Amino acid sequence: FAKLVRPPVQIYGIEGRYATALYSAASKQNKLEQVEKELLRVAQILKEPKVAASIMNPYVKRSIKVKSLSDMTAKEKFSPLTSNLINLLAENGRLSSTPGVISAFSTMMSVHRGEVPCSVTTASPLDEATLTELKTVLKSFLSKGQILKLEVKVDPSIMGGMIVRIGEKYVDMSAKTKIQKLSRAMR
Amino acid sequence: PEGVRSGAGAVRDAGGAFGKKEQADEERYFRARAREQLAALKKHHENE
Amino acid sequence: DYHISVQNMMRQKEQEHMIRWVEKHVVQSISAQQEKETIAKCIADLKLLAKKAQAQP
Amino acid sequence: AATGRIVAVIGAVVDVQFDEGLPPILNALEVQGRETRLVLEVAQHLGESTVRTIAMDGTEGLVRGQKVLDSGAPIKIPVGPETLGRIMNVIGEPIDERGPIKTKQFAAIHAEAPEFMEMSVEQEILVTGIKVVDLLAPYAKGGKIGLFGGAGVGKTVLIMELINNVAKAHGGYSVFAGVGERTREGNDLYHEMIESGVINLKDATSKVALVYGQMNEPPGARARVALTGLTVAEYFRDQEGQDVLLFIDNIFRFTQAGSEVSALLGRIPSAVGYQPTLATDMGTMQERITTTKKGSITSVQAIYVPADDLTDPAPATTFAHLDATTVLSRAIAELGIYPAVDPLDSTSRIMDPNIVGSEHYDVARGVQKILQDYKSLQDIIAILGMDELSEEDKLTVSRARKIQRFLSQPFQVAEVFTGHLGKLVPLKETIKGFQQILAGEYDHLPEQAFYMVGPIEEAVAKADKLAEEH
Amino acid sequence: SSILEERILGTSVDLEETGRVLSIGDGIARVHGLRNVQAEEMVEFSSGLKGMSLNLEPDNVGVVVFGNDKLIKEGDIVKRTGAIVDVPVGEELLGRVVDALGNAIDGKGPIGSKTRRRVGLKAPGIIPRISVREPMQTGIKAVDSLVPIGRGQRELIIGDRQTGKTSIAIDTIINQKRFNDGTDEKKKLYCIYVAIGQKRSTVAQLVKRLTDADAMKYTIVVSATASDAAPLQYLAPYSGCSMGEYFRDNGKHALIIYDDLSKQAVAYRQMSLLLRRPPGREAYPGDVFYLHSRLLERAAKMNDAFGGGSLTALPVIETQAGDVSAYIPTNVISITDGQIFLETELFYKGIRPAINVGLSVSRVGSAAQTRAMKQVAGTMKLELAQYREVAAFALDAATQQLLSRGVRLTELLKQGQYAPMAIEEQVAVIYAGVRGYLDKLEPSKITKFENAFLSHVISQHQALLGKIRADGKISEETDAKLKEIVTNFLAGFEA
Amino acid sequence: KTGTAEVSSILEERILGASVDLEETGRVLSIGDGIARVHGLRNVQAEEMVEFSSGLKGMSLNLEPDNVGVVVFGNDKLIKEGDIVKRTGAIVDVP
Ligand SMILES: Nc1ncnc2c1ncn2[C@@H]1O[C@H](COP(=O)(O)OP(=O)(O)OP(=O)(O)O)[C@@H](O)[C@H]1O
Ligand SMILES: Nc1ncnc2c1ncn2[C@@H]1O[C@H](COP(=O)(O)OP(=O)(O)O)[C@@H](O)[C@H]1O
Ligand SMILES: [Mg+2]
């Protein structure tokens, strides 16, 4: 068996298997962006309730489903290896997890130029000027990488402070110090 | 052939009351004779 | 022995209640306006602290 | 020439993924980044460029994604005449703190058995000096020997006395392998062999090599030390035309160690919780301990019987691989008779009238017949008392009791326990003493004169002193 | 007032690696996240709990919790400390009661320690060891005379329920006071007690019993009761062995006791099944033998190049309806060096302690035993061995005398509770019996004679005992004295 | 419920279009303890003898919808993933 190119994120599962195979296929012949766009279009066209009813009925014959999908993918527009992917999924009867496969491919492509997702949590909504200052310093921590993804969350459960997550890094600066002060009772 | 078949010496293998009762009697009976045999050995050797 | 034991028990009870009172009044005293002003001061302080941490690659 | 990464660590089983080349089964791998040396051995191919391995040491501290190297061959150990008087590891590393082992050759511990057209057909007797073995179940040169027994009946003392009697009077070399036993005894043997002069720390006239893996090791190591032990002896048998001796202590731990990882390898258990590959695994190893036409190997193996049950699948499938068996029993030991050898459950292959003569054969069969007849009389005595028996039955019982005592013997390595000096008895005195007792020439002596003595000449000298002191 | 102000008077935050929880149930947590995490590494939860990672899989990590699990919930945060699990060690732990992880639960205060040590380490090899040569005295007459124990050995106590296993260890611990209250440090011994699976009130009564005899000044108690989580009961014995090993490497001697090793295997079986590992015989894991083999191998006697220290072990096992051929007991029988058997039928026939001398063994050969005791015990062995083989039938020259002596000898071995004896007094009391000075008195009154004679000898003849203690052996003059003392007191003692 | 043949290497060749027989030959997927899983051999009869690349022989016992399990007449050391198996069209016979 010929060796294949390994995706960075390397998720697992049946959707993981199909996504890894498709990524190895796309790395060869250099069609990553085109296949991502075509997968988005396929996600667009499979949300029709009529074709969903055709695809969510176990009584119908597999042969009928294969031709229906082959005709749709031959008359819609594109004929990349995505047609082969659709045909293989139809033959193996894995048409239920197609959203999972396309989502896995989407997150796989996102980490190809990975944005290093981050999160900031606060008790009260901070000002936007303080927000852009925080972005300015968070990019300084980011260093080598791409544009950080900032999720602003307002949780008033904490008395006050700030919680930051950057990838697997984690710094907690909040009213959690009350536990530290309570530990005086122990010693 | 299907049932349980016994053999020889099964009474002393279970180690119940009868096994120890059997053992002590032999111990006593053969503890008794050694005195006579030793006395006759001493008399024989002293005589000659 | 009897008197010494009784006095020690009283001391222990008073210490426990004082600790509880201090903690509860800390929670009670912390007010939303205090939280706003302290959180502004903390925004400055924690931004500087993040700068300090990021200064160590 | 390949590099992999660790992707899973469960218990003592590790999985490695390779991106360039796939090593074959039974290959050695080395982990990178540890202060000590950790070695992995390949077992299965799982597909999608992955293997499942077994560790030879502790696995704590491992991290997913750690680099692993490939050596390209099975485990290799030093071999030659420079390993005499040294202690080595499962993977061939000194553990006696005296420097490296400097040889010129190396060997792989996984080989294949000799073929049908290389076997030998020879049978000669090997005298040891023990009455029971030399009378009821003789040993043979270039044969296989087994010592079955439970817990606490005396396997180790007997295997030490066999060394002390046979090894010192032997021209050739010897190998000792310890599999899954106490370290405290491995400290005793080493210092015992120094005083006797068999192992020398100054000259170059040693005669024994030692290999050790004990019960404080993970199951991976305990299931391989035997192959390392026999690989050394194969060198002294083939590359040099000399006779060798091989002693193994508790070969049962070789099978138990393989049952502790079978479930983690994805297997359905067989009866009484054993792996489904018991007999084949045992047979593959046992076939390499043989005397071919280029040399001779005489082997002695100690076997453990769980809970005194001889129908257990581990000892049950071992009787077929031996030429002579001795079975130790707990009932005899409680009477105070040592060694506690069962006289009606031991067998040998050279117990034939055309190999040992007619006199020797008739004496042993006559002893066994009366020992079998003794058992049936003990049922009658339970119900009716001893004195109601006929005189012939009393004479039969009196002779049988005296025969039973005369089989005991004081050993030389047990002077601390018993408090007597050891004895050795040649074969002719062994035959003649039992022939005389069967004839009836000592019906005028008490039983106690036949207990813990050597030849027949000492029992009357003991009885005379007993008479004098009365 | 100012004390608490100073406590709060004495805060840094730094980045850490983190995973997130996927699932939680029955004490097992599945964590997505952590990448560079070692096997058998201690991690910390948000609330304050602690855990250890055992299964490292491609997509998750299986973590067992050291405590309750009603606070963990999906979506939480886990951090890694970076160190393999370890416990505090030292000699500041003497006189304290601590849990399985080294936390005080007696209410005294914090423990001031300066050293830590891992719980999983390897036993010494072949070179650093030496033979066993010194005695370990207990105070039980039936043990010190027929089943002697040396320093550096392992010995098993096995029996049914309600037979008397705990009181042997409790008596052994108390006896060591007469040596620790002395001058030379070559005859002192420290003690460690580990309780697994028992309820709290029993441990409280045991600690009260110890503290009223002035014995807590040199003992350490490690407890993991029946209300604790399974991982703590699984981890408790190693945490105590690691505390015992500290004395062994500094030229000192120590003693350790594992109470009810049978209750560690049930916690191991519970912990393993919830991790989705296949079962085996009686659903036990596939390697229960290796659980105890790596534990009982850590007791050894070191030679002079390493200091000369030692460590002794005394495990305990319980059997169902006197069945010694079960699964677990057979594993541990084949590891130790000897065993002591206790039976109910002997317990109800007035033989207390109920030691079966026909089966109990000790694979030391009396190499470590005082010279004086051997002279009077080697001769008692033969008397009892010959008594057993005849005197059970469910003449006067041999048989009547034999059982007349045997019935006297049996009565001498009975003993009370919480009262061990010194060696020389046992030597004297056995010397009286063996020589035949008590072959005339009715057997029913022997115990009163023992008590009164011991009190009289202790009070009026304090100089005689010192001779036997100092010399280590009997002498012609001592033998001459003892006969006169015995005959005179026997004549005077008829009441 | 992932099948034995639902692996990335097999699927990718179907994705990349595509000279292989798959009617008289096959390829090995996994090997261990004397059992081999083979992909292909659509015409193999039950209880038939095949030949491996090295020179060893085997026998077909399980005919599953996506693979066939074979028992090896020798030592597993000479078989590795990716080898080629071919038919012989006969059942065992002796002189
Ligand atoms: N020498 C003795 N004399 C009198 N009573 C004794 C003696 N030894 C033990 N006992 C009594 O035997 C009983 C059981 O003793 P012990 O607590 O040691 O049992 P155990 O084997 O630990 O039981 P368990 O399985 O319940 O823990 C207690 O009532 C104790 O007082
Ligand atoms: N002459 C003897 N021969 C063998 N064993 C003896 C003898 N005398 C006493 N024994 C006892 O038999 C026991 C056997 O010990 P060991 O050989 O270690 O058991 P195992 O056979 O299980 O290894 C020893 O502890 C010893 O006390
Ligand atoms: Mg042994």
Ligand SMILES: [Mg+2]
């Ligand atoms: Mg108890």
